[PDB]
Design a binder for this molecule. Structure first.
Ligand SMILES: *[C@@H]1O[C@H](CO)[C@@H](O[C@@H]2O[C@H](CO)[C@@H](O)[C@H](O)[C@H]2NC(C)=O)[C@H](O)[C@H]1NC(C)=O
Ligand SMILES: *[C@@H]1O[C@H](CO)[C@@H](O[C@@H]2O[C@H](CO)[C@@H](O)[C@H](O)[C@H]2NC(C)=O)[C@H](O)[C@H]1NC(C)=O
Ligand SMILES: [Cl-]
Ligand SMILES: [Cu+2]
Ligand SMILES: [Cu+2]
Ligand SMILES: [Cu+2]
Ligand SMILES: [Cu+2]
Length: 497
């Protein structure tokens, strides 16, 4: 069952075996993935997070981010450790109390301390729209239509050896899948449909790293939502989904009653489907309980291409229709060397005092904010353009901006910008060498907003900056509760800082 919008959420350690290999994990709600948090557009969420963690190998502190929610006036509840809060210490709790005006769609939540979400603290977050403009396109939209894609590691995140390549051990679809090596025939997830019905499938990448080529044998998929933004209908037969992205698609259960493979091929780790890796099962009601016998095509006829997506609403693009046609045009120099990422020559290392607290304490320009060189001020009520030219090792990098969604004026693998009707989203692949993926947004949300690669291993290696949007108005716009004010002193005491 779905929980929320007002709920407790316990964070605990437990052993799990989603691919037949047992290891300890960091879990929300006792499960991997965590339980779906849900409500309606405009609701007040009050998620009281109880930190009950005791195993230091996966960190006993935590902080939770509500990915894609704008947090306007509630920057303190956004979750990124050392940006908007100090972590919650073990044996304590914290009420993330916020509202979701003007948003409806598919989101997710995850730890935002170190690489802890990789150890299991990840789950779906759905904001339903009682007056959804896409409602007539489908018959079913509920917990049974959520599809999560996750990477899973046998080695604990904190224990990944310095200097060795990090790859996953399994792909998990709805929490189940088979290991790439020493594959055993552990249970696969089943997604059940009834012949003739239409389903709003909510596809959520909760990945720490790989992108997936997602498809369903025999079926096609009509995209209706991108990262919370309603789209015009776009029919595709494969979706390349990057870490932290979401799509909703209509699945028409219009094939013969049977079993069909659901495929999610990561860009690293096990290649193909031998032994049922990278797989789940779409089962029609009345089908035999047995594995599918279907195959994929050699070549997909209609893969998703991002420039084919367009908003359902007339969203346009802010600013003027040319490069640099913004109030604050930025071009970030994104680089990697010697194990560390950098943005404009600075590798991100989290500060001791959270950025928001530094601002509330009176730091009022970005040159006064720590970490030095990692915080960039943005002016209020302005059009911002950010160019994110690719080339840094480890790509393609899915960049994500907190506090905002943005127009994707230029997408991967295509040198032509779109100043008319590009999709808006919150996580975008910056592509490959020579690309110039570029985003635009307007600054109407005061506070410090993280911008980073959502490959969690790259964030940990410094691939981030903070946009301190409207520093002068941050304090007035974001009143803080006493419980938030108490986080830093409690954390610093517990850690002898
Ligand atoms: C990506 O686009 C940005 C503009 O959005 C380009 O930035 C220009 O860079 C040149 C030097 O390369 C400067 O002289 C300009 O001041 C920049 N701003 C402009 C033209 O608006 C950037 O070069 C592009 N990068 C790639 C790799 O194509
Ligand atoms: C590369 O991106 C451009 C810009 O988004 C795409 O160009 C648009 O193509 C559509 C469909 O033909 C036209 O309606 C638009 O007028 C084009 N816009 C512009 C600014 O050119 C283009 O299709 C993409 N290339 C590929 C191969 O998908
Ligand atoms: Cl966000
Ligand atoms: Cu996220
Ligand atoms: Cu986010
Ligand atoms: Cu990256
Ligand atoms: Cu983040």
């Amino acid at each position: 069952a779905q929980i929320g919008p007002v709920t407790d959420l316990h964070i605990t350690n437990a052993n799990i075996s989603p691919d037949g290999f047992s290891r300890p994990a960091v879990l929300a709600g006792g499960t991997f993935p965590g339980p779906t948090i849900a409500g309606n557009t405009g609701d007040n969420f009050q998620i009281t997070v109880f930190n009950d963690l005791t195993d230091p190998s996966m960190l006993t502190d935590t902080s939770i981010h509500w990915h894609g929610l704008f947090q306007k006036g509630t920057n303190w509840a956004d979750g990124p450790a050392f940006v908007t809060q100090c972590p919650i210490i073990t044996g304590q709790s914290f009420d993330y109390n916020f509202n979701v005006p003007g948003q409806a769609g598919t989101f997710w939540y995850h730890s935002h301390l170190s690489t802890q979400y990789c150890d299991g603290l990840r789950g779906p977050f759905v904001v339903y729209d009682p007056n959804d403009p896409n409602a007539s396109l489908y018959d079913v939209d509920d917990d049974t239509t959520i599809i999560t894609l996750a990477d899973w590691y046998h080695t604990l995140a904190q224990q990944e050896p310095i200097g060795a390549a990090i790859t996953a051990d399994a792909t998990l679809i709805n929490g189940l899948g088979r290991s790439f090596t020493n594959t055993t025939a552990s249970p696969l997830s089943v997604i059940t449909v009834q012949s003739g019905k239409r389903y709003r499938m909510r596809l959520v990448s909760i990945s720490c790293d790989p992108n997936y080529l997602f498809s369903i044998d025999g079926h096609d998929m009509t995209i209706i939502e991108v990262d919370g933004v309603n789209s015009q209908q776009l029919t595709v037969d494969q979706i390349q989904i990057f870490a932290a992205q979401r799509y909703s698609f209509v699945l028409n259960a219009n094939q013969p009653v049977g079993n069909y493979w659901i495929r999610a091929q990561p860009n690293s780790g096990g290649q193909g489907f031998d032994g049922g890796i990278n797989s789940a099962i779409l089962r029609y009601e009345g089908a035999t309980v047995e594995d599918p016998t279907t195959t994929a095509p050699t070549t997909f006829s209609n893969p998703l291409v991002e420039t084919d997506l367009h908003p359902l609403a007339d969203l346009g693009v802010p600013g003027q229709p040319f490069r640099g046609g913004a109030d604050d045009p930025l071009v970030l120099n994104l680089a990697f060397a010697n194990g560390r990422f950098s943005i404009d020559g600075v590798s991100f290392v989290p500060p001791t005092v959270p950025v928001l607290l530094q601002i509330l304490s009176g730091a009022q320009n970005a040159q006064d904010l720590l970490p030095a060189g990692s915080v960039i001020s943005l002016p209020s009520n302005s059009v911002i353009e950010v160019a994110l030219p690719a080339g840094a090792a480890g790509g393609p990098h899915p960049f994500h901006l907190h506090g905002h969604n943005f127009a994707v004026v230029q997408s991967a693998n295509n040198a032509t910008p779109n100043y008319v009707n590009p999709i808006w989203r919150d996580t975008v692949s910056i592509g490959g060498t020579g690309d110039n993926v570029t985003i635009r947004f307007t600054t109407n949300n005061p506070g410090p907003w993280f911008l980073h690669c959502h490959i969690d291993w790259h964030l940990e290696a410094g691939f981030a900056i903070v946009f301190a949007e409207d520093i002068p108005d941050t304090a007035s716009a974001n009143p803080v509760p006493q419980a938030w004010s108490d986080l830093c002193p409690a954390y610093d005491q517990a850690h002898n800082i």
